[PDB]
Design an enzyme around this catalytic site. Structure first.
Site, PDB file in Angstrom:
ATOM      1  N   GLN A  20       0.780  -1.241   0.000  1.00 51.82           N
ATOM      2  CA  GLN A  20       0.000   0.000   0.000  1.00 51.82           C
ATOM      3  C   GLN A  20       0.811   1.291   0.000  1.00 51.82           C
ATOM      4  OE1 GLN A  20      -3.458   0.369   2.580  1.00 51.82           O
ATOM      5  NE2 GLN A  20      -3.574  -1.856   2.704  1.00 51.82           N
TER       6      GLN A  20
ATOM      7  N   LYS B 229      -0.653  -3.859  -4.638  1.00 52.59           N
ATOM      8  CA  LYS B 229      -1.874  -3.040  -4.827  1.00 52.59           C
ATOM      9  C   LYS B 229      -1.669  -1.809  -5.702  1.00 52.59           C
ATOM     10  CE  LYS B 229      -3.976  -3.378  -0.210  1.00 52.59           C
ATOM     11  NZ  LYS B 229      -4.172  -4.820  -0.051  1.00 52.59           N
TER      12      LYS B 229
ATOM     13  N   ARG C 227      -9.271   4.792   7.247  1.00 46.22           N
ATOM     14  CA  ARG C 227      -8.082   4.738   6.374  1.00 46.22           C
ATOM     15  C   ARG C 227      -8.494   5.568   5.165  1.00 46.22           C
ATOM     16  NH1 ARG C 227      -6.174  -1.118   5.117  1.00 46.22           N
ATOM     17  NH2 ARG C 227      -8.386  -1.499   4.574  1.00 46.22           N
TER      18      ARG C 227
HETATM   19  C1  LIG Z   1      -3.402  -5.736   0.339  1.00 50.21           C
HETATM   20  C2  LIG Z   1      -2.258  -6.104   1.213  1.00 50.21           C
HETATM   21  C3  LIG Z   1      -1.647  -7.328   0.960  1.00 50.21           C
HETATM   22  C4  LIG Z   1      -2.380  -8.566   0.287  1.00 50.21           C
HETATM   23  O1  LIG Z   1      -2.417  -8.361  -1.145  1.00 50.21           O
HETATM   24  P1  LIG Z   1      -3.544  -9.313  -1.899  1.00 50.21           P
HETATM   25  O2  LIG Z   1      -3.495  -8.825  -3.406  1.00 50.21           O
HETATM   26  O3  LIG Z   1      -4.784  -9.014  -1.161  1.00 50.21           O
HETATM   27  O4  LIG Z   1      -3.016 -10.772  -1.690  1.00 50.21           O
HETATM   28  C5  LIG Z   1      -0.284  -7.539   1.258  1.00 50.21           C
HETATM   29  N1  LIG Z   1       0.343  -6.514   2.067  1.00 50.21           N
HETATM   30  C6  LIG Z   1      -0.336  -5.344   2.427  1.00 50.21           C
HETATM   31  C7  LIG Z   1       0.434  -4.400   3.336  1.00 50.21           C
HETATM   32  C8  LIG Z   1      -1.662  -5.130   1.985  1.00 50.21           C
HETATM   33  O5  LIG Z   1      -2.364  -4.075   2.534  1.00 50.21           O
END
Ligand SMILES: *Cc1c(COP(=O)(O)O)cnc(C)c1O
Ligand SMILES: [Cs+]
Ligand code: NA
EC number: 4.1.1.64
Length: 431
Positions: A244, A270, A404
């Site tokens: 993120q 993401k 958030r």
């Molecule tokens: C979203 C998230 C993940 C998981 O990614 P997915 O595509 O849902 O497997 C991994 N690390 C962080 C810090 C996230 O917020």
């Protein structure tokens, strides 16, 4: 209208529920900073979808690159290389800190963390993984085993050797020395306990630079550097999960650039795919060479697929040329100021934290007691939606509900203002 009887009938009859409750609307389109329901009502997307759409929804350049590769070079046997893949891997090497040289192109964040964890275990010959007590790294096995904010109960043992230490949290400090919050001493105390429990097989520590699911907990000054030294002293790799925080959201291309601490492996997801399933890990040439010598394997359907790679490269091109990392700081500061103004007006806002366009607002009943406000947080969120502002509140034990707030890095001044206005009104009516 959102009430489509057959849509909701099909939804109830045919969807596996996977956490939370579904919003009571039917989203039919999305553009920029907004999503639109079946009535055509614009809803300001203050979470960039699932904390991911850094370029906002349906950005024309993404539309363009997607259609182009969908019709020209889409998916390939995993042993076949193509230019989007080599270019994206090269770009990633070039925009990440020195010492991060080689990339692996995957699809999801959990998946990127699994690849990183597997690589660390292989090159260290060890298997214990340490994360933070309020971490979120994904739903799959090893990522879930290092995830402490939620999901550990009812599904059997976690992976062997899984440990957690408390994250440094300046708003709710619990480790004092000389009448002040000594988070560095807290880190030493935690590792001494880790050391005593360990079988002598510490392979890595995995960490988010700002814990999102856990309540927008930003690691404070000097902490990351101290964490990296704890790893170095134990021959552990430091894996930083920037699912993120990466790709400009916090006001630097990668959050690790702020502290100047370069991890052994960086994971991205993401924000790299900006809505599309693309993820990656980047590591040093030395670690990759050793992993290869030891037979590293991480073969997936979509590893090195050209269409996702082409999308990720276009995302980076846009962020760089349109200066979206800088926009995160300017729109981020505008948003933060507006939130502090609300804090001046409403005693229930106990804290405004975060960095760039990854901000958190913690709701409390008592600013002196910091007593969590049970129900108020949920109320405010419901009022925001009624007002056309999409928000997300996370709730962990011993903490107040935390909003958030992560709008697209392409969000306009008027859109930040609209959000601040709808939020203030939501609080007004939630009280
Ligand atoms: C979203 C998230 C993940 C998981 O990614 P997915 O595509 O849902 O497997 C991994 N690390 C962080 C810090 C996230 O917020
Ligand atoms: Cs592939
Ligand atoms: Na680099």
């Amino acid at each position: 209208l959102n009430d489509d009887a057959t849509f909701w009938r099909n939804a109830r009859h045919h969807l596996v529920r996977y956490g939370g409750t579904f919003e009571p609307m039917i989203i039919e389109r999305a553009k920029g900073s907004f999503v639109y329901d079946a009535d055509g009502r614009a809803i300001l997307d203050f979470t960039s979808g699932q904390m991911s759409a850094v370029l906002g929804h349906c950005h024309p350049e993404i539309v363009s690159v997607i259609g182009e590769y969908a019709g020209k070079l889409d998916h390939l046997f995993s042993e076949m290389l193509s230019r989007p893949v080599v270019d994206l891997a090269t770009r990633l090497a070039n925009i990440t800190p020195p010492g991060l040289d080689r990339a692996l192109l995957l699809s999801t964040g959990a998946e990127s963390n699994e690849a990183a964890i597997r690589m660390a275990k292989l090159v260290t010959g060890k298997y214990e993984i340490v994360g933070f007590a309020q971490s979120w790294h994904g739903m799959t096995g090893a990522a879930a085993s290092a995830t402490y904010s939620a999901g550990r109960k009812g599904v059997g043992p976690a992976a062997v050797g899984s440990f957690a230490i408390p994250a440094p949290f300046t708003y709710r400090p619990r480790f004092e020395r000389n009448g002040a919050y000594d988070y560095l001493a807290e880190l030493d105390y935690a590792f001494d306990l880790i050391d005593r429990q360990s079988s002598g097989n510490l392979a890595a520590f995995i960490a988010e630079p700002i814990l999102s699911s856990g309540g927008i907990i930003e690691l404070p000054d000097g902490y990351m550097a101290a964490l990296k030294r704890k790893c170095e002293a134990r021959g552990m790799l430091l894996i930083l999960d920037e699912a993120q925080t990466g790709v400009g959201r916090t006001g630097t291309m990668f959050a690790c650039q702020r502290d100047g601490v370069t991890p052994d492996i960086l994971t991205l997801s993401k924000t790299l795919g900006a809505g599309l399933p693309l993820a990656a890990i980047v590591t040093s040439a030395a670690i990759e060479e050793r992993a290869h010598e030891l037979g590293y394997l991480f073969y997936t359907t979509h590893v090195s697929d050209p269409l996702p790679a082409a999308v990720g490269l276009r995302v980076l091109d846009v962020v760089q040329r349109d200066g979206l990392v800088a926009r995160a700081n300017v729109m981020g500061d505008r948003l933060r100021r507006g939130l502090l103004d609300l804090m001046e007006r409403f005693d229930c806002i106990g804290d405004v934290r975060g960095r760039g366009l990854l901000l958190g607002v913690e709701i409390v009943k008592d600013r002196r007691t910091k007593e969590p406000a049970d129900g108020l947080g949920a109320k405010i969120t419901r009022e925001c939606m009624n007002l056309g502002l999409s928000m997300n509140i996370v709730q962990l034990p011993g903490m107040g509900g935390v909003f958030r707030i992560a709008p697209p890095l392409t969000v306009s001044e008027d859109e930040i203002d609209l959000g601040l206005s709808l939020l203030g009104q939501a609080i007004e009516r939630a009280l």
